[PDB]
Design an enzyme around this catalytic site. Structure first.
Site, PDB file in Angstrom:
ATOM      1  CG  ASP A 138      20.450  17.447  45.252  1.00  0.00           C
ATOM      2  OD1 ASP A 138      19.917  16.486  45.859  1.00  0.00           O
ATOM      3  OD2 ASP A 138      19.907  17.998  44.262  1.00  0.00           O
ATOM      4  NE  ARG A 142      17.638  13.992  43.066  1.00  0.00           N
ATOM      5  CZ  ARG A 142      17.668  13.654  44.352  1.00  0.00           C
ATOM      6  NH1 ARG A 142      17.362  12.427  44.753  1.00  0.00           N
ATOM      7  NH2 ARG A 142      18.033  14.561  45.258  1.00  0.00           N
ATOM      8  CG  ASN A 143      21.384  14.897  41.377  1.00  0.00           C
ATOM      9  OD1 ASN A 143      20.597  14.970  40.425  1.00  0.00           O
ATOM     10  ND2 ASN A 143      21.098  15.382  42.587  1.00  0.00           N
ATOM     11  CG  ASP A 156      21.803  18.897  40.230  1.00  0.00           C
ATOM     12  OD1 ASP A 156      21.895  19.735  41.149  1.00  0.00           O
ATOM     13  OD2 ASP A 156      20.851  18.856  39.411  1.00  0.00           O
TER      14      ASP A 156
HETATM   15  C1  VUZ Z   1      18.676  10.618  36.655  1.00  0.00           C
HETATM   16  C2  VUZ Z   1      17.639  11.360  36.304  1.00  0.00           C
HETATM   17  C3  VUZ Z   1      17.584  11.768  34.846  1.00  0.00           C
HETATM   18  O1  VUZ Z   1      17.317  10.982  34.013  1.00  0.00           O
HETATM   19  N1  VUZ Z   1      17.843  13.106  34.460  1.00  0.00           N
HETATM   20  C4  VUZ Z   1      17.845  13.474  33.072  1.00  0.00           C
HETATM   21  C5  VUZ Z   1      16.944  13.143  32.074  1.00  0.00           C
HETATM   22  C6  VUZ Z   1      17.176  13.647  30.798  1.00  0.00           C
HETATM   23  C7  VUZ Z   1      18.290  14.449  30.536  1.00  0.00           C
HETATM   24  C8  VUZ Z   1      19.185  14.740  31.561  1.00  0.00           C
HETATM   25  N2  VUZ Z   1      20.385  15.556  31.451  1.00  0.00           N
HETATM   26  C9  VUZ Z   1      21.595  15.067  30.821  1.00  0.00           C
HETATM   27  N3  VUZ Z   1      21.509  14.073  29.956  1.00  0.00           N
HETATM   28  C10 VUZ Z   1      22.614  13.640  29.361  1.00  0.00           C
HETATM   29  N4  VUZ Z   1      22.535  12.572  28.377  1.00  0.00           N
HETATM   30  C11 VUZ Z   1      21.466  11.599  28.410  1.00  0.00           C
HETATM   31  C12 VUZ Z   1      21.572  10.309  27.926  1.00  0.00           C
HETATM   32  N5  VUZ Z   1      20.419   9.693  28.093  1.00  0.00           N
HETATM   33  N6  VUZ Z   1      19.557  10.571  28.668  1.00  0.00           N
HETATM   34  C13 VUZ Z   1      18.197  10.231  29.011  1.00  0.00           C
HETATM   35  C14 VUZ Z   1      18.228   9.230  30.163  1.00  0.00           C
HETATM   36  C15 VUZ Z   1      20.164  11.735  28.874  1.00  0.00           C
HETATM   37  N7  VUZ Z   1      23.809  14.187  29.628  1.00  0.00           N
HETATM   38  C16 VUZ Z   1      23.988  15.214  30.505  1.00  0.00           C
HETATM   39  C17 VUZ Z   1      25.278  15.798  30.803  1.00  0.00           C
HETATM   40  C18 VUZ Z   1      25.378  16.847  31.723  1.00  0.00           C
HETATM   41  C19 VUZ Z   1      24.224  17.328  32.352  1.00  0.00           C
HETATM   42 CL1  VUZ Z   1      24.403  18.629  33.554  1.00  0.00          CL
HETATM   43  C20 VUZ Z   1      22.979  16.749  32.066  1.00  0.00           C
HETATM   44  C21 VUZ Z   1      22.861  15.677  31.119  1.00  0.00           C
HETATM   45  C22 VUZ Z   1      18.943  14.248  32.811  1.00  0.00           C
END
Ligand code: VUZ
Length: 301
Positions: A138, A142-143, A156
């Site tokens: 995948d 986006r991942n 992901d």
């Molecule tokens: C690319 C698509 C997307 O935007 N997915 C998304 C949206 C919101 C939250 C997550 N997960 C996630 N988020 C963060 N930190 C973050 C910073 N700014 N945002 C909003 C854009 C989120 N860190 C992560 C670390 C590990 C994992 Cl497994 C997920 C996240 C994804």
């Protein structure tokens, strides 16, 4: 095979505190929060992914297993799970979110040095997954998530082993075969995604037509900013003969060579006069009691 001696760490619900929601979905939800190991005098930024129906708790635990089994700088590493009514994955907070949104929002400030450095960093991530006999299945923009603008990480693994059609190899779309070389194919798509600053691959074409289009010999266009040198590497990822595709170790090498002279290989207007936030910036560290904060990359066992 050799035995998987990864440690899975079980964390107490009181050992961390959610602070805000980052997004909501089918799985449940993702919180920005803070993990304070009791009696340690460190506060660690984390993302918390929480869910309840048994046959889906199995899926979240499976992702957790995968993610506890990996350790590489360009793979987002998991920190622990917390057992409450709903399972919760605790992993390193990636502050700038997903690379796809990042390039969309920041097109006007992304230089060729940043682009090529990303391309290298992902080729490294995937080469490590290949070392660990892991197939992502995948891989997409986006991942990949953005720790700093100079540091991205694959994140992901809800589909890794030992349906997103427009990112998948031909053998995969038709025969459900997946190997490291179909991961190469999706790497090529991903690169396209970056070089077009977050464009939608095959926008419009419904995913059912994709298989036959590819069958004929059509592929994605050459992004305007790409020299032929970069586009040719994208294209070599989209061969039908999977062995004709490059191996991640060579993708690393080629993008390294290109990231030594970034402007010889990507033509962007106003390049080299562009700024993105850096750890050597002011206020770069905020998202109010950062006394004793440690990035997860530096808290070890
Ligand atoms: C690319 C698509 C997307 O935007 N997915 C998304 C949206 C919101 C939250 C997550 N997960 C996630 N988020 C963060 N930190 C973050 C910073 N700014 N945002 C909003 C854009 C989120 N860190 C992560 C670390 C590990 C994992 Cl497994 C997920 C996240 C994804």
């Amino acid at each position: 095979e050799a035995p998987n001696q990864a440690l899975l760490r079980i964390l107490k619900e009181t050992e961390f505190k959610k602070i805000k929601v980052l997004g909501s979905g089918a799985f449940g939800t993702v919180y920005k929060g803070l993990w304070i190991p009791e009696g340690e005098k460190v506060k660690i930024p984390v993302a918390i992914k929480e869910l309840t129906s048994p046959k889906a708790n199995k899926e979240i635990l499976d992702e957790a297993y995968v993610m506890a089994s990996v350790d590489n700088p360009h793979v987002c590493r998991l920190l622990g799970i917390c057992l409450t009514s709903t399972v919760q994955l605790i992993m390193q907070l990636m502050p700038f979110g997903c690379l796809l949104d990042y390039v969309r929002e920041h097109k006007d400030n992304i230089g060729s040095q940043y682009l090529l450095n990303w391309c290298v960093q992902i080729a490294k991530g995937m080469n490590y997954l290949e070392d660990r006999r892991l197939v992502h299945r995948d891989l997409a923009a986006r991942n990949v998530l953005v720790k700093t603008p100079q540091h991205v990480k694959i994140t992901d693994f809800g589909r890794a082993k030992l349906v997103p059609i427009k990112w998948m190899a031909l053998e995969s779309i038709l025969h459900r075969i997946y190997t490291h070389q179909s991961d190469v194919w999706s790497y090529g798509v991903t690169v396209w995604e970056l070089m077009t600053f977050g464009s939608k691959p095959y926008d419009g074409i419904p995913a059912s037509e994709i298989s036959s289009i590819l069958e004929k010999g059509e592929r994605l266009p050459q992004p305007p900013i790409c020299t032929i040198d970069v586009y040719m590497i994208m294209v070599k990822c989209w061969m039908i003969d999977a062995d004709s595709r490059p191996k991640f170790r060579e993708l690393i090498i080629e993008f390294s060579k290109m990231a030594r002279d970034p402007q010889r290989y990507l033509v962007i207007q106003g390049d080299e006069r562009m700024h993105l936030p850096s750890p050597t910036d002011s206020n770069f560290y905020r998202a109010e009691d950062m006394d004793d904060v440690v990035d997860a990359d530096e808290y070890l066992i």
